[PDB]
């Protein structure tokens, strides 16, 4: 079955730029599911403090981005677009041989809402893949609502996480990881060359949120 | 206060489908005509459009014309030609479409041994090209994600699909949302301004990739709305 997934328990997860909403939201849910999580930050002090407020008795701690990248079995990139290239260029060697999950949305915002920025490489995920030929780059978690992830009263989210990439085993691991967030199914969304439109659909989700006063997600039907 | 889900009454409206003799055009036509709308199929040949119309038309208000006459006949006009013919068709009909709601469902897609991918478009997207060719029309992007074979299938009572409807004109988008809802199962969901149409068009390459992996006719639903 294409729905079959590997057992990913005992994988540790680093989250780079883990000190904001997206990173804290993912870290919180993975730690609640039992994974050791390592938050990364440009300042290790700031990461350890955020880790300490994240939830009592959760297996989470903080380091600088390089330590986090070195510590984690799987590494999630959750920095803003503006620091994406420079971060990954600096951690090329630390990330060699690892699954690296890019959730970065290159978006702009003006008085009419959100829009998608152009990217030389095709997409944030394709940029990552071009910088890190020795990593298995996977694109995932662009559509999560970090506020729902962080909220203690949210038990489940109504979301299929699209997981893109060129290596089957890597995309499978990240689909299994996605499913540790209650309500989520990890759904194979294509090869990395079709990540642009996934990142950019976040601008449409922002538009939808505004129109409908919602924290919208997506489900794929018929699968 | 009005719900964003509320729909205008479109029960008057005739629909023209340009390039309406293919699977997409026939499937839309079938469903719209089953819901009571007059549908005019367009073709490069009036006789071919008439023939396809006769095939679809048992018990249904479907007729055929050349593209120019369908475009003139339709209250709302759907563009269902391949990406290769899109520019040339629309330049030719510029005056005939002035002042009309024009719906672009065209997906600029490439295919190779690794599956589907999305083509670059100078204007941003097929819909934004349409809007640049047709400044006097009200261009709406919709219907990119429909599975035409499901629309044609007498065994399929309803489709598990939100149709994303994009555009810069609120009334035009609302009309098109209401048209989309004439397909059983479907909600017409506002998906943003026309500048965010590229990603919608291109996401059809992701659906294709899903269909090939899971062996499926995948759709999408927007949740929490
Ligand atoms: N928020 C959501 O709902 C959501 C959902 C899906 C995806 N995303 C994506 O996740 C990423 C982060 O979102 P966010 O809401 O958490 O944003 P954020 O708070 O602006 O950024 C996350 C963290 O990145 C670090 N950082 C900032 N600038 C940096 C730079 N130039 N170089 C290296 N690190 C830097 C900061 O940590 P330190 O100061 O501790 O280094 C900051 O706390 C974005 O790319 C976004 O598109 C967000
Ligand atoms: N099939 C689907 O499930 C689906 C779903 C969503 C969107 N779409 C999109 O809908 C459009 C139509 O798809 P389809 O499957 O119906 O394709 P199609 O059968 O390849 O094309 C539809 C019709 O377009 C006309 N045509 C072809 N080339 C033309 C040109 N250069 N100039 C003017 N007319 C031309 C032909 O009609 P005449 O020969 O009678 O003029 C043909 O029957 C495409 O842009 C596709 O991306 C398809």
What domains can you pick out in chain A, each with its CATH number?
A: 1-223 (3.40.50.720)
Q: Which two tokens stand for residue B116?
A: 């589907």
CA atoms within 13 A on the CB side of B155: 2
Asked if A176 contacts A186 with a C-beta cutoff of 8 angstroms, the reply is yes
Which ranges in B58-113 belong to alpha helices (H)? 67-73, 83-93
CB-based contacts of A82, cutoff 8 Å, min separation 6 = none
Output the CA B2–ligand 2 centroid distance in Å: 37
What is the spatial distance between Cα A64 and Cα B185, in angstroms, rounded to a whole number?
A: 50
- Return the number of other C-beta atoms located less than 10 Å from residue A7's C-beta: 8
Query: What is the dihedral sign for C-alpha A83, A86, A91, A95?
Result: positive
Question: What ligand has the least distance to the C-alpha of B64?
Answer: 2
Task: Pick A214's closest partner by Cβ from B117, B217, B225.
Answer: B225
Q: What residues in A contact B213, CB-CB < 8 Å?
A: 2, 188
- Asked if A156 is an interface residue toward chain B (Cβ–Cβ < 8 A), one would say no
Asked if A58 contacts A28 with a C-beta cutoff of 8 angstroms, the reply is yes
Residue B222: beta bridge partners?
Answer: A218
Q: What does this entry list as its resolution, in Å? A: 1.8
Burial of A129 (0-12, 13-18, 19+ CB in 10 A): buried
Question: Taking CA B173 as the corner, what is the angle to CA A196 and CA A113, rounded to the nearest 5 degrees?
Answer: 50
Which 3 state secondary structure label does DSSP give B172? helix
What is the spatial distance between Cα B108 and Cα A137, in angstroms, rounded to a whole number?
A: 26
CB-based contacts of A121, cutoff 8 Å, min separation 6 = A127, A129, A130
Kindly give the interhelix angle for A196-212 and B197-214, rounded to the nearest 10 degrees.
Answer: 120
Which 3 state secondary structure label does DSSP give A78? coil
What is the spatial distance between Cα B138 and Cα B82, in angstroms, rounded to a whole number?
A: 21
Asked if A184 contacts A29 with a C-beta cutoff of 8 angstroms, the reply is no
What is the spatial distance between Cα A218 and Cα A142, in angstroms, rounded to a whole number?
A: 11
What is the spatial distance between Cα A63 and Cα A55, in angstroms, rounded to a whole number?
A: 17
Asked if A200 contacts A166 with a C-beta cutoff of 8 angstroms, the reply is no
Radius of gyration over every alpha carbon of chain B, rounded to an integer in angstroms: 16
H or E element at residue A207: helix A196-212
**E strands of chain B, at which residues?**
15-18, 39-43, 62-66, 76-79, 101-104, 109-112, 115-118, 138-141, 162-167, 187-192, 219-223
CB-based contacts of B170, cutoff 8 Å, min separation 6 = none
CA distances from A216 to A26, B93, B221 (A): 17, 38, 10
| Cβ < 6 A, ligand 2 pocket | B 19, 21-25, 43-45, 48, 80-85, 89, 105-107, 143-144, 146-148
Which 3 state secondary structure label does DSSP give B194? helix
Query: Cα torsion for A29, A34, A39, A45, to the nearest 10°?
Result: 110
């Amino acid at each position: 079955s294409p729905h079959d997934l590997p057992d990913v328990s005992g994988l540790s997860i680093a989250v780079l730029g883990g000190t904001g909403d997206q990173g804290r939201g993912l870290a919180r849910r993975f730690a609640m599911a039992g994974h050791e999580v390592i938050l990364g930050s440009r300042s290790a002090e700031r990461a350890q403090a955020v880790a300490a407020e994240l939830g009592e008795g959760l297996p989470v701690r903080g380091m600088d981005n390089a330590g986090a990248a070195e510590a984690g079995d799987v590494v999630i990139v959750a920095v803003p677009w503006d620091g994406h290239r420079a971060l990954l260029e600096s951690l090329k060697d630390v990330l060699a041989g690892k699954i690296v999950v890019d959730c970065v949305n290159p978006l702009g915002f003006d008085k009419r809402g959100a829009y998608a920025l152009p990217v030389e490489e095709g997409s944030a995920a394709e940029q990552a893949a071009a910088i890190l030929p020795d990593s298995r780059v996977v694109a995932a978690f662009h559509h999560v609502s970090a506020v729902l992830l962080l909220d203690p009263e949210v038990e489940k989210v109504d979301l299929d996480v699209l997981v893109l990439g060129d290596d089957r085993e890597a995309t499978d691991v990240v689909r299994a990881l996605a499913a540790r967030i209650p309500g989520v199914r990890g759904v194979y969304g294509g090869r990395l060359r079709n990540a642009h439109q996934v990142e950019a659909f976040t601008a449409n989700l922002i538009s939808i949120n505004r129109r409908y006063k919602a924290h919208a997600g997506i489900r794929i039907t018929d699968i």
